[PDB]
Design a protein around this nucleic acid. Structure first.
Ligand code: MG
Ligand code: MG
Length: 670
RNA sequence: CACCCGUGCAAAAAUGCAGGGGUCUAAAACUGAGCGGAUAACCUCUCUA
RNA sequence: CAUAGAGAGGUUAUCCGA
């Protein structure tokens, strides 16, 4: 947009006045004008970024000075929703939660629209921590190849946990057996950074107490991120100073290892939040660590800039005691950029190079009953980062069976540019681009011991791992969207409840929030109220104020059923859709995009689990089309995507392609 | 090529034109893709000792 | 099966890089 090119950073309504900010150093925002009614007021006299061409209640026109001269217009926030039609009034968020959010974080509602932006940034911090903690937990569950991991409480210490071995309660006995089945697993070496200690050039598995406290911290972070648990648990992440000493010690050693590797400040004074973030990073791919840490840096810097602007205006800003964490956001920003100066992808163990041999041999389906050939293949595979980011997220035999799904590899090869494909093909098999793609796909699907200087083998091996890496990473990044979606459902349910909406229990039925917002109710499990405009005009948020999307969300929700939506929720939140890729991707006639692939996986998982069960006739028709057409059904997607109705933009983005992926826009339907 | 909002001109309650949105979406700017040279460390054969 | 430079290749902190 040209407004940003003109340098108007933000527009802040305060009372009957609006303030306009400029782009300063980094994300610093310097105030420029205080436009009261229709009156000019210079607030900065040194290098003013822009000047006001004309001031009108409709909008303010500005011309850039620092950059290439460009004139733009900025709409008045005071009259955001008051137009043709109370003309001037501070706007509110689309979800109509602004007063509740302000009264949650601050002691009172505020007559401005600055605070809500800080709040939304904090709320985005929690979303990104939710996704990355669920990816960590999934990696660990994959390793086990699961209630134990999902139910980890910080309060419970190791001294209490070990008692469960002696205990007679069957669930507690299983809670301990699942722990003793995790010390080994012949896969714990994957996360050596957080599971092994250096103590002749050798390392050893850490003491059980520290492995437990690592796992406890990560499980608690994940569960707290997803469920937004009530009581004192809600403040947990913003009050880690109260952690048990054992978790402080564990965090201290884990974060201190890089420092002893490099000397940057020791863990003795870096905050527990930063150390917990680093611990979370230990389980992620490098791309995920970078996205996490940069989004944290961005949001904390925004928070700092808003707090500075509020302090310059003289607004009251002191957080309630339970959120006084954010008063330190300057230091947590400094610590996050310090971490970002040295964080690296989590190493494999140099000794486990001999333990991993069967996994490497499995991925390629290369197994029998000279040794040098297999050793060469294995060691050439194991060192590649496309292995480290694959066996941590998929079972090797499951990947090898998935690679037989010819249309999925054919699709992924259709995404690679013609030049890259030519290069690979001329390395791998020394005639048209699509015929070449087809043949390469066939080669990948029939990999065997025929590979046996004439060194062809590196070309074919590096191709295969790259195709499977791209496929699995895309499916994980699709899953992340619905994970964020359910996180938002479970948070906004509680926020609406605190605003006084009769939302009720969300775990009983995940569509309860969208129905509470729409004002419909269930009797005998059926929505007997037909569409009428008054229900849209009375809808509790701006998204559902429109007639046609109320009508559409109603018609889709009426043909949902509770069991399917709950099974979908748990399929997303445990990533079972990809964990059973072998059977879900079994029979796909044609793959159109990663969205169609992911929803085919989910719908085939549902069709497997509901094979012999109660099933509503709408679900039965969807499954019948999912069989008759060997591809995902769009209608079914809408049915199990209903709980996200409250946010129309989210709902639409997650239910038709072309709106799904920012990078692959395309035609929408109807 | 999504949503919401402002403003101007047709019109019968809607459409075309031009913009804005950290307070919409993973989504305020500040991108990404693929790749051509360094030092060292790094294991894997494959050579003989 | 020890331990003895050159050999051949993979991988890792950064531009000259569709
Ligand atoms: Mg929300
Ligand atoms: Mg989850």
């Amino acid at each position: 947009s040209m407004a940003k090119a003109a340098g108007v950073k933000s527009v802040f309504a305060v009372g009957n006045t609006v303030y306009m900010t400029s782009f300063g150093r980094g994300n610093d925002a310097v105030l420029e004008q205080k436009i009261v009614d229709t009156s000019h007021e210079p607030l900065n006299i040194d290098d003013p970024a822009y000047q006001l061409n004309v001031v009108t209640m409709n909008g303010y026109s500005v011309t850039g000075h620092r950059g290439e001269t460009v004139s733009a217009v900025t709409d008045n926030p005071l009259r955001r929703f008051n137009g043709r039609k109370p003309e001037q009034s501070v706007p509110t968020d689309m979800l109509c939660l602004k007063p509740t959010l302000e009264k949650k974080f601050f002691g009172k509602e505020f007559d401005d629209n600055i605070h809500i932006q800080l709040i939304y940034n904090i709320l985005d911090i929690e979303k990104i921590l939710a996704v990355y903690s669920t990816n960590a937990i999934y990696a660990l569950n994959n390793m086990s190849a699961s209630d134990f991991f999902m139910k980890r409480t910080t309060d419970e210490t190791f001294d209490d946990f070990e008692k469960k071995k002696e205990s007679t309660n069957s669930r507690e006995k299983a809670d301990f057996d699942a722990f003793e089945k995790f010390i080994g697993n012949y896969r714990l070496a994957y996360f050596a950074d957080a599971f092994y200690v250096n103590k002749k050039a050798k390392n050893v598995l850490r003491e059980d107490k520290e492995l437990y406290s690592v796992l406890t911290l990560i499980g608690k972070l994940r569960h707290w991120c997803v469920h937004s648990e009530e009581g004192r648990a809600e403040f947990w992440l913003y009050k880690l100073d109260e952690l048990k000493d054992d978790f402080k010690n564990v965090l201290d050693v884990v974060y201190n290892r890089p420092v002893e590797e490099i000397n940057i400040s020791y863990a003795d004074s870096v905050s527990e939040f930063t150390k917990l973030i680093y611990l979370l990073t230990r389980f992620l791919s490098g791309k995920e660590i970078n996205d996490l840490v940069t989004t944290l840096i961005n949001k904390f810097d925004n928070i700092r800039s808003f707090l500075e602007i509020m302090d310059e205006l003289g607004l009251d800003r002191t957080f309630t005691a339970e959120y006084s964490f954010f008063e330190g956001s300057t230091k947590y920003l400094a610590e996050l950029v310090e971490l970002n100066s040295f964080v690296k992808s989590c190493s494999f163990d140099i000794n486990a190079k001999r333990t991993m041999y069967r996994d490497a041999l499995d991925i390629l389906g290369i197994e029998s009953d000279n040794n040098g050939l297999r050793n060469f293949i294995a060691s050439n595979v194991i060192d590649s980062n496309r292995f480290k980011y694959l066996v941590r997220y998929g079972n090797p035999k499951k990947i090898r069976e998935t690679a037989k799904c010819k249309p999925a590899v054919r699709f992924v090869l259709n995404e690679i540019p013609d030049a890259q494909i030519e290069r690979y093909y001329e390395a791998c098999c020394p005639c048209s681009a699509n015929k070449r793609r087809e043949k390469l796909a066939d080669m990948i699907a029939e990999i065997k011991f025929e590979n046996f200087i004439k060194r062809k083998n590196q070309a074919i091996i590096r191709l295969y791992l790259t195709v499977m890496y791209i496929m699995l990473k895309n499916l994980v990044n699709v899953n992340a969207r619905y994970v964020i979606a359910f996180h938002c459902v479970e948070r906004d349910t509680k926020l609406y409840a605190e605003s006084g909406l009769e939302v009720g229990n969300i775990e009983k039925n995940k569509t309860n929030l969208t129905m509470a917002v729409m004002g419909v109710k269930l009797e005998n499990g059926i929505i007997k109220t037909e569409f009428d405009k008054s229900f849209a005009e009375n809808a509790a948020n701006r998204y559902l104020r429109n007639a046609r999307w109320y009508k559409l969300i109603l018609d889709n929700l009426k043909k949902s059923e509770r069991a399917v939506v709950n099974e979908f929720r748990n399929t997303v939140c445990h990533l079972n859709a990809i964990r059973n890729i072998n059977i879900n991707i079994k029979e796909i006639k044609e793959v159109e995009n990663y969205f169609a692939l992911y929803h085919y996986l989910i719908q085939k998982h549902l069709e497997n689990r509901f094979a012999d069960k109660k099933v509503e006739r709408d679900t039965g028709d969807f499954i019948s089309k999912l069989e008759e057409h060997k591809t995902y059904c769009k209608d079914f997607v809408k049915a199990y995507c209903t709980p996200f109705g409250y946010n129309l933009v989210r709902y639409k983005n997650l239910t038709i392609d072309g709106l799904f992926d920012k990078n692959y826009p395309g035609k929408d339907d109807s």
